[PDB]
Design an enzyme around this catalytic site. Structure first.
Site, PDB file in Angstrom:
ATOM      1  N   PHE A 111      -6.834   4.568   6.238  1.00 11.82           N
ATOM      2  CA  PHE A 111      -6.230   3.606   7.443  1.00 11.82           C
ATOM      3  C   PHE A 111      -7.191   2.977   8.042  1.00 11.82           C
ATOM      4  CE2 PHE A 111      -2.972   7.042   6.288  1.00 11.82           C
ATOM      5  CZ  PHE A 111      -2.123   6.074   5.798  1.00 11.82           C
ATOM      6  N   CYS A 113      -5.158   0.806  10.690  1.00 14.80           N
ATOM      7  CA  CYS A 113      -3.710   0.368  10.244  1.00 14.80           C
ATOM      8  C   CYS A 113      -2.747   0.721  11.616  1.00 14.80           C
ATOM      9  CB  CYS A 113      -3.392   1.472   9.065  1.00 14.80           C
ATOM     10  SG  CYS A 113      -1.740   0.911   8.649  1.00 14.80           S
ATOM     11  N   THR A 171       0.779  -1.276   0.109  1.00 15.17           N
ATOM     12  CA  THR A 171      -0.051   0.114   0.011  1.00 15.17           C
ATOM     13  C   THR A 171       0.787   1.174   0.096  1.00 15.17           C
ATOM     14  OG1 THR A 171      -0.182  -0.511   2.441  1.00 15.17           O
ATOM     15  CG2 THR A 171      -1.941  -0.763   1.067  1.00 15.17           C
TER      16      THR A 171
HETATM   17  C1  HEM Z   1      -0.302   4.288   2.830  1.00 19.72           C
HETATM   18  C2  HEM Z   1      -0.087   2.952   3.213  1.00 19.72           C
HETATM   19  C3  HEM Z   1      -1.198   2.187   4.198  1.00 19.72           C
HETATM   20  C4  HEM Z   1      -2.502   2.186   3.896  1.00 19.72           C
HETATM   21  C5  HEM Z   1      -3.329   2.870   2.934  1.00 19.72           C
HETATM   22  C6  HEM Z   1      -3.158   1.037   4.718  1.00 19.72           C
HETATM   23  C7  HEM Z   1      -4.234   1.022   5.091  1.00 19.72           C
HETATM   24  C8  HEM Z   1      -4.558  -0.169   6.230  1.00 19.72           C
HETATM   25  C9  HEM Z   1      -5.978  -0.374   6.248  1.00 19.72           C
HETATM   26  C10 HEM Z   1      -7.283   0.276   5.429  1.00 19.72           C
HETATM   27  C11 HEM Z   1      -6.074  -1.316   7.286  1.00 19.72           C
HETATM   28  C12 HEM Z   1      -7.393  -1.867   7.945  1.00 19.72           C
HETATM   29  C13 HEM Z   1      -7.645  -3.290   6.907  1.00 19.72           C
HETATM   30  C14 HEM Z   1      -9.329  -3.653   7.487  1.00 19.72           C
HETATM   31  O1  HEM Z   1     -10.051  -3.115   8.319  1.00 19.72           O
HETATM   32  O2  HEM Z   1      -9.495  -4.835   6.943  1.00 19.72           O
HETATM   33  C15 HEM Z   1      -4.928  -1.612   7.729  1.00 19.72           C
HETATM   34  C16 HEM Z   1      -4.600  -2.657   8.604  1.00 19.72           C
HETATM   35  C17 HEM Z   1      -3.427  -2.879   8.984  1.00 19.72           C
HETATM   36  N1  HEM Z   1      -2.050  -2.226   8.392  1.00 19.72           N
HETATM   37 FE1  HEM Z   1      -2.026  -0.815   7.196  1.00 19.72          FE
HETATM   38  N2  HEM Z   1      -1.947   0.430   5.447  1.00 19.72           N
HETATM   39  C18 HEM Z   1      -0.572   1.227   5.106  1.00 19.72           C
HETATM   40  C19 HEM Z   1       0.594   0.936   5.569  1.00 19.72           C
HETATM   41  C20 HEM Z   1       0.977  -0.137   6.218  1.00 19.72           C
HETATM   42  C21 HEM Z   1       2.355  -0.342   6.973  1.00 19.72           C
HETATM   43  C22 HEM Z   1       3.629   0.317   6.445  1.00 19.72           C
HETATM   44  C23 HEM Z   1       2.292  -1.545   7.647  1.00 19.72           C
HETATM   45  C24 HEM Z   1       3.246  -2.058   8.554  1.00 19.72           C
HETATM   46  C25 HEM Z   1       4.516  -1.428   8.667  1.00 19.72           C
HETATM   47  C26 HEM Z   1       0.703  -1.935   8.010  1.00 19.72           C
HETATM   48  C27 HEM Z   1       0.215  -2.746   8.523  1.00 19.72           C
HETATM   49  C28 HEM Z   1      -0.953  -3.112   8.877  1.00 19.72           C
HETATM   50  C29 HEM Z   1      -1.416  -3.872   9.843  1.00 19.72           C
HETATM   51  C30 HEM Z   1      -0.749  -5.034  10.584  1.00 19.72           C
HETATM   52  C31 HEM Z   1      -2.941  -4.173   9.897  1.00 19.72           C
HETATM   53  C32 HEM Z   1      -3.949  -5.052  10.633  1.00 19.72           C
HETATM   54  C33 HEM Z   1      -4.178  -4.206  11.958  1.00 19.72           C
HETATM   55  C34 HEM Z   1      -5.059  -4.838  12.915  1.00 19.72           C
HETATM   56  O3  HEM Z   1      -6.064  -5.144  12.346  1.00 19.72           O
HETATM   57  O4  HEM Z   1      -4.528  -5.085  14.069  1.00 19.72           O
HETATM   58  N3  HEM Z   1       0.121  -0.987   7.123  1.00 19.72           N
HETATM   59  N4  HEM Z   1      -4.107  -0.832   6.864  1.00 19.72           N
END
Ligand code: HEM
Length: 441
Positions: free
Chosen positions: A378, A385, A253
């Site tokens: 996010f 996120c 992402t």
């Molecule tokens: C601009 C970049 C990013 C965007 C737009 C983004 C977006 C998201 C979104 C929308 C979710 C929620 C997923 C859901 O509800 O089903 C999420 C969860 C998550 N993201 Fe990000 N992400 C980005 C970058 C990152 C990075 C760099 C990492 C790790 C270093 C990361 C790690 C995670 C993790 C581990 C989850 C699950 C969190 C949980 O439910 O406890 N993401 N992300």
């Protein structure tokens, strides 16, 4: 009173499925949203969900006391590989809160200051690559952004060097990932190589490298760190799932974000000029300091505005914890699923005005003015996120350095073509970068 839910036409037992016969389902669903409004039901053989697009309904859906994170069909396939890692666990699964508590300190401001030098390492490698291209050459934008973001999570999270810039094709780790992300997306449009197990050597190599090897990163917390609630560490099986989770979530992402940001900048020369002038003014040293990145205010606005138009993780799914009524009009029964169409949320004219398609970073001038639940790239609540500040720091730092060091040309007059693998990318985006010949440190 109690309203009948909008729904597109159904075709016998096929239901709505013939309307999603595409490799670009989110974009197709956005068109249906334009037609039917803020909510529609969508049925396919055996399964049903409701697509939300307005801030008024999504703010309700974002009530964690009533709705929790659902694993969409796509996430159920990723779970084959990512297991009960943070991203593909249910909230009510023990390992969710457990790993959340264990891994959260890895994204504290401070752990973040501690990542900066390694971020700069990969960023310099990016800039040096582009400095070293010959006059006849061009840049493959998403391909290079992926080299950078994969290497950044590798090094910052796991002290592992993917050395993506020493390869002219994508890293073998990526090539597997890409095929499983698409086949999971394709398996949805089926009414009636995916098994071919490649990344487990990589996972072994990451753990073994650490086994030998003064680290205090994500991997250290995975290996040693125990959950303050229950005293439990992560087990071996879950640790492996978390490594995979963070390698895929930690790069894909962010790469799409950087790609869209460069796209919008080269299409909006006056935005590029202002972004470039901020970068030159703020980044006065041979390599950026942690503090200087935080001073790149307009570059941050540019990134948020790219996420507004094309949030690179474009949907998230929720289910009703109990029988409830949505929007005072739509009764839902326990277990009923909702999908938040983020790109559609981000085009809600009642929030953003009626120039929602224009790329205007100044919308983010004073962010506290933006209503709650209007901007959700996010995700939401406790399942938002975890890596948000990491992604934005990396992207701001990188875009800052790009704009300091090069002038960019949209030499093919690129026509936006957004590839969907449950993340979004501008497929085939290429530019030429003309060096301003400013030395690195
Ligand atoms: C601009 C970049 C990013 C965007 C737009 C983004 C977006 C998201 C979104 C929308 C979710 C929620 C997923 C859901 O509800 O089903 C999420 C969860 C998550 N993201 Fe990000 N992400 C980005 C970058 C990152 C990075 C760099 C990492 C790790 C270093 C990361 C790690 C995670 C993790 C581990 C989850 C699950 C969190 C949980 O439910 O406890 N993401 N992300």
């Amino acid at each position: 009173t109690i309203k009948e839910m909008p729904q597109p036409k159904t075709f016998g037992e096929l239901k709505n499925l013939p309307l999603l016969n595409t490799d670009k389902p989110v974009q197709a669903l956005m068109k249906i949203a334009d037609e039917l409004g803020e909510i529609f039901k969508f049925e396919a053989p055996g399964r049903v969900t409701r697509y939300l697009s307005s801030q008024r309904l999504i703010k309700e859906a974002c009530d964690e006391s009533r709705f929790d994170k659902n694993l969409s069909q796509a996430l159920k396939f990723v779970r084959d590989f990512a297991g009960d890692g943070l991203f593909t666990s249910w909230t009510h699964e023990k390992n969710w809160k457990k790993a959340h508590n264990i891994l959260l300190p890895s994204f504290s401001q401070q752990a973040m200051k501690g990542y900066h030098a390694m971020m700069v390492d990969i960023a310099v490698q990016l800039v040096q690559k582009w400095e070293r291209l010959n006059a006849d050459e061009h840049i493959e934008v998403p391909e290079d952004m992926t080299r950078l973001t994969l290497d950044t999570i590798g090094l910052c999270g796991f002290n592992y060097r993917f050395n993506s810039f020493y390869r002219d094709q994508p890293h073998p780790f990526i090539t597997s990932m890409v095929r499983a992300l698409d086949e999971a997306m394709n398996k949805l449009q089926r009414a009636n190589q995916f098994q071919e197990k490649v990344m487990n050597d990589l996972v072994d190599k990451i753990i073994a490298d650490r086994k030998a090897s003064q680290s205090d990163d994500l991997l250290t917390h995975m290996l040693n760190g125990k959950d303050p609630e229950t005293g439990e560490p992560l087990d071996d099986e879950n640790i492996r799932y978390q490594i995979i989770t963070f390698l895929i979530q930690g790069h894909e992402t962010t790469s799409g974000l950087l790609s869209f940001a460069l796209y919008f900048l080269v299409k909006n020369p006056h935005v590029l000029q202002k972004a470039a002038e901020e970068a030159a003014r703020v980044l006065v040293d041979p390599v950026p300091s942690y503090k200087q990145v935080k001073q790149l205010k307009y570059v941050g606005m540019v990134l948020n505005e790219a996420l507004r138009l094309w949030p690179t993780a474009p949907a998230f799914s929720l289910y009703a914890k109990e029988d409830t009524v949505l929007g005072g009009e739509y009764p839902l029964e326990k277990g009923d699923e909702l999908m938040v169409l983020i790109p559609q949320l981000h085009r809600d004219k009642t929030i953003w005005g009626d120039d929602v398609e224009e790329f205007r970073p100044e919308r983010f001038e004073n962010p506290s003015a933006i209503p709650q639940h209007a901007f959700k790239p996010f995700g939401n609540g406790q399942r938002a996120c975890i890596g948000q500040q990491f992604a934005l720091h990396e992207a701001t730092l990188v875009l800052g350095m790009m704009l300091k060091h090069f002038d960019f040309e949209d030499h093919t007059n690129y026509e936006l073509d957004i590839k969907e693998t449950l993340t979004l990318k501008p497929e085939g985006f290429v530019v030429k970068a003309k060096s301003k010949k400013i030395p690195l440190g």
